[PDB]
């Protein structure tokens, strides 16, 4: 309330002093050649002004201030502080208008990968992909960014990080009526989860999904895949999932639609499903 | 009295199944969560030790150089 | 024999109490784990920043102050 | 104990030494103009005396020395060190005199938020709220501090902390303040967890709280909101709380207090209460006429 | 021999009791450890922040003085 | 009644299996958490030592500059 | 290995040329007065020879080297380095002969307290307490060390560590039959966790133990104490522990050993007991 | 790939520049003086080329560049940048051709153990062991490396990781080495966690494998071992896995294949026999006579 109003008043004041600063500092460099200290101090003026803009609940102007400071600082032939300014501007633009946030974050990733550090590049890429997913619909860019992030993580031996990104990519790929990539990623991660002392318990789940997606093509291939997986994983038959898959196969063989639906409904009753599985099952039933 | 026998039995089976499955899922996901922080702590330790070595050696060499100047 | 099934009722109620407690325990362990991770990420960010800045500053200043002579 | 007596004696000695040091520093600045060292080692004397004194189990004078040292240090254009000394002095005064601790902590928070750090400011705000409510009996200031902390946290997408703070604020407001804020906060937070990996079977309780508050307002609003939630979130249909709420609604409809009493008694028998639901239920029962 | 089946059910109930209470007791202490972890994390974070600020201000002041 | 008790037999088997699984899950969790705690302790030690060293470093360096 | 022990001999030769380095202080530092850095490198060679000894599994020699290096290095300067050397010497002495480790750790404690780093000092106090427990037999000194550590920890609001330390202190004191202290500590820790959502479920155990200790001294007051606990915590009676304690105390009204014996055996028939509880019950129930 | 095509083009450009920089090095060691700084810039450009190569997917060239840079760097009386570059080269060689990775990691380990940091050396040792077992078909060197890692860890008081290391090494040795070491390590580890009240809920399994190891040699000493175990640990006698032992030995005394087979098959229920134990049971069965 009043705090914000006063902050914005002195904010306009400080910005006026900052434009005065920049103009008279270039003038003083021309007429006296004082060096570059005045440029630096002007940079901290921009920084503190942007901080208090953020204090004042006006994000767009804060992002503009951060971007201006970053560009002047990199014009001063120093990178990392400029990097921090750009990433701060992107975080500010996250809410409200995020489009230019994409460009700035890309610039930050560009400089980071130019230096040679990779993990933060992966973090920024996943953030950008999250922005596209949450606010836009061009899922193709999301696929590209997630794949790049997974590549970076897996290249740096961060095995755990890569799996999450690959799973997200596989889910979205299966969403857009493409099945080869989903099959490959699911089976690869499932096999890589075979010997994990901790993850072994969950290793079944991924395999199950694969079979389901693999069933979208035909029936005999699905049987071959499921029996192959059962051979590769002897304990797979213990869980109810194999029972359910076998029921689905046998029912769909003999056009027993009602029993198929009732078995699905019973499995739902014992444990409910999500949108993804329900949608896939319904799409399967369509034939 | 077999009616309440059947009623309590169906209540017991349903509740037991749902509770058991919920516990199983909650646990499984916590397990899969822990590994990320494991490796994150690994990385932060690596960075911290690198910092320690670099700063220590820099300062000691700089004290030696300052003594040389003095 | 019916008092035996009454005892069965008592023990299943004991199971009820124990299982409800277990469920709530897991639900309350979850958020702590999550918040721990949410602190870890930030500390990682800051330590990386610190190491990078220290390295570059010391290296550049040292080369400058050693070669100007 | 010998340690306490000796520490107090040498602490008085060090304080007198620092006082004479500062007066002689005022003298020497004109006399010799040594720069600013005199004051800084005077500050070091003050800090060492303060830490040894706090080790000596005596608190108030320790925080007083911390405040004096930080004041004289900030007199020399050094801010962050004085701010850390302020924070330490507040932690010391926490057990001595709340008012001075609150003042110093507010000073630290303002200087920090001027610096540009928000998370530390939010942490200090939470500490201020906790001390304000735990021993001093007042809520409104606590609500304001918690709200500011949540705002600062959300400023840097630290979602979990802001979630917790807002939940506590909503609970406190519902207890004493009006209900609209509670409605909005509880409903938003609850419906911001339907999608997730572990935070998926917890949310239920939040909606239940909201329903109770709605019911506290009026019966028609109660039923309308219950239907709204029923449609919006399918799983709430099969919650035990849902059947409990329906039974309570239909019982209160006909003015048969025995049904309400037996229902609540059975609910309590199955699972233990929380001491917050019981008060609301008693208040509801108070208006059966 | 259905009574023997009931007796097997009773011993299964005994095993359920033991396993459930054992898991409960272990988990409680799991919680206490996960609380201690969160307590330590705040202190390490604060130390990191203080070191960062001190190093930054000191190095920049020295670099400015060098000019 | 017979089918009901057969279903309850299936239920007792399933409950046994699940309980056992939870038992193993918990013990593993415990172990891993303890390891994490130990590593946290060591890193905290190192960080505090670095803090002290750098503080006295800056102090001595600024005093040396003052000597100049 | 064997020739690394030969280089341990050559590291005693390193110590011999270090003896020549102190012979520098004896005569040659008159012309090398500025060789304080020479003393520093003498300390460094001391340290790396000591590390070689550590690799050689000669614990006594390694500790000797550490202590000598610390003594030479602590020339009223670089105190924290001397502290690190002292704590390293103490860790080395931990195995084999640990007595002098106590003195060195005490000196390090004094240095840190002069500095004010309380957490490390308290941790080292815990270390000396546990080595006292596991190697020597004195317990009262362990009690004093634990008390001092708990005070230091509680100074800086690190409550949980202080609570566990006080719990161990209470257990030891109860083994030493000074019940007032044990009951005080147990009651404090019990009723200081009732209203936080993370430690909420432990309370029962603490109360139970407190009850027993109370029940040891004045049985008549035990009933009032348990009633006070029950009313303070409504959900205390439901737990099995309160029921068992009620059965024991009510049975004791009549002299019937069989009743309590069967009760305790039945309780043990659901979970095993510990030495502490079993010993306390055996001692107390004798009269 | 056009991206990778331009990446490799600029990689070749930087390689030509680095060749010109080694020409600079030879012209500044034999032609000029003070090239140490010039070859330091050469090292900087080499590190740039190596990192960008790593980004280019050409792992072998990246590793070669890292190794060349490190070996050139070693000549400037600097050891830590040596370590870093050697470790980076080893990580690069991990994939593709790992043989020389072993040598470079050994060099780095030597440097570190010369310096004095032990924990990092132990971590690199365990990495060497894991890569050697996963991709190289040989196990005895794995035993040696795990042994050294265990020595280092238990020397520095980090008991926990040491415990697992020793456990794995002993378990593996059981498969292809005399069982005495297995018995020793298993017995040692059992009691060394029997006390702490969390890790100790599991030692049953360790004592169980120890019993299997004893049994695989002879029966009588196995009976003595099991009776001693249950004498020391009263709560392992009235256990579950435990009885499998009494029924199995009683059956084996009578030389009756059917009962032993049905007993192990029975035990299968509610816990799937794993790869190791199964092999053990088959091995003991094969020599019933």
Author numbering:
A (entry chain F), G (entry chain H): 0 to 286
B (entry chain C): 17 to 86
C (entry chain A): 191 to 259
D (entry chain G), H (entry chain E): 0 to 288
E (entry chain D): 17 to 83
F (entry chain B): 191 to 258
Article sentences:
The membrane-anchored SNARE (soluble N-ethylmaleimide-sensitive factor acceptor protein receptor) proteins provide the energy to drive membrane fusion in various cellular contexts, such as intracellular trafficking and exocytosis. Supercomplexes of NSF, α-SNAP, and either a syntaxin tetramer or one of two binary complexes of syntaxin—SNAP-25 reveal atomic details of SNARE processing and show how sequential ATP hydrolysis drives disassembly. NSF comprises three structured domains connected by flexible linkers—the adapter N-domain followed by the D1 and D2 AAA+ domains. Six NSF protomers come together to form the active form of the enzyme, a homo-hexamer.
We observed a nearly symmetric ɑ-SNAP—SNARE subcomplex comprising four ɑ-SNAP molecules coating a four-helix bundle. Even without further processing, this structure was recognizable as a parallel 2:2 syntaxin—SNAP-25 sub-complex formed by two syntaxin H3 SNARE domains and two SNAP-25 SN1 SNARE domains; this binary 2:2 configuration was previously observed in crystal structures of syntaxin-1 H3 and SNAP-25 SN1 domains and was unexpected as we prepared the complex with full-length proteins, implying that two independent SNAP-25 molecules contribute their SN1 SNARE domains to this complex. To improve the resolution of the spire reconstruction, signal subtraction and local alignment were performed as before. This approach improved the reconstruction of the spire proteins to 4.22 Å, enabling docking of a crystal structure of the 2:2 syntaxin—SNAP-25 SN1 complex into the density, which was of sufficient quality to assign characteristic side chains, to identify the SNARE domains, and to determine their directionality. The 2:2 binary complex was fit back into the full reconstructions, enabling modeling of the full 22bin20S. A representative 22bin20S model (class #19, 3.56 Å) and ɑ-SNAP—2:2 binary SNARE subcomplex model (class #23, 4.14 Å). Four ɑ-SNAP molecules bind the 2:2 binary SNARE complex, with two SNAP-25 SN1 SNARE domains and two syntaxin H3 domains. This configuration locates two independent N-terminal portions of the SNAP-25 linker bearing cysteine sidechains often palmitoylated in vivo near the membrane. Symmetry was not enforced during local reconstruction. Note that the near-twofold symmetry of the bundle leaves some sidechain densities poorly defined.
